[PDB]
Symmetry: C2
Subunit: 176 residues, 2 copies
């Protein structure tokens, strides 16, 4: 259920947001958009639990808010090359497509795993630089990597071959 998705946010994203704001202002701002995107994703999982799978045309419309937060995540990073936190900004900007697992079938889990590999290329740099030197950096990496690992496990149990829609539900081309 959606509570299991929120449990992942509570466990990993919560502390991650705080560490992000503590590390640097532009990392905090980029992660605020990731959090807004994650909230939108939770809402789409809930809508899908209540609705018949929509047409491809309708699906392309439902994903728009997510893609717009992804544009901003990428813009903040690409415009901050001269940040002392560029590897942190990259870990997120180069793996924000994990959000698109909701329109991937039959491999939403592998879609997230691909994006975790891209995040890790940068977070491995952060650990090499900061292990034993800045515990906030180390814990920031742990929270994001664990979030992606646990998101893949959530997908594998609850949306194994694709986001779970409801064949007896209402029309997705709706909202509230």
């Amino acid at each position: 259920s959606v509570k299991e998705f929120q449990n992942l946010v509570d466990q990993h994203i919560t502390p991650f947001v705080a560490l992000s704001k503590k590390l640097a202002p532009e990392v905090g701002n980029q992660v605020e958009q990731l959090v807004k995107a994650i909230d939108a994703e939770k809402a789409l999982i809930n809508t899908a639990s209540q609705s018949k799978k929509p047409s491809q045309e309708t699906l392309l419309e439902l994903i728009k808010p997510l893609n717009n937060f992804a544009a901003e995540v990428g813009k903040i990073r690409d415009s901050n090359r001269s940040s002392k936190f560029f590897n942190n900004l990259s870990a997120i900007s180069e793996s924000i497509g994990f959000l698109s697992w909701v329109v991937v079938e039959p491999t939403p889990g592998p879609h997230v795993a691909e994006m975790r590999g891209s995040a890790e290329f940068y977070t491995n740099r952060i650990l090499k630089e900061f292990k034993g030197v800045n515990q906030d950096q180390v814990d920031w990496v742990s929270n994001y990597v664990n979030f992606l690992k646990d998101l893949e496990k959530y997908i594998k149990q609850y949306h194994t071959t694709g986001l779970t829609w409801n064949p007896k539900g209402g029309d997705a081309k709706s909202a509230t």
Copy 2:
């Protein structure tokens, strides 16, 4: 060497530019920014061939042009999610960090290979959709993927553990 780098460009990038412009205007526009970045990368190779390795502060300034065109490649893709060629846009935007091999040590080749895996995640989608249907899409993929594979081979041969500087050269910040 500068001439061998240009040879990669002639073999793979030049026909790729023609295919891009032919496929869609936004793909042609994104690829023209990629070419400007490759032109800047060739010039840095030339600079390094004739200059002593500069300070870390100076290296950060020398790569700004490259990074500026990379930001634009990303911007065009992120702004065109309505493109009927989004996988083509993503193959480039998600791998444009291959350009940064010029500041990576001792693993510039693995750096490009990591970016090639990100490009292939998207080009494999293009091939699955278009092999047997649109030879221009197939050839577009082949040229980009072969440019990255040949670039990794070029790095292995001429800049194995890092871009080659000249310890008996001039100042990188200026020429003759």
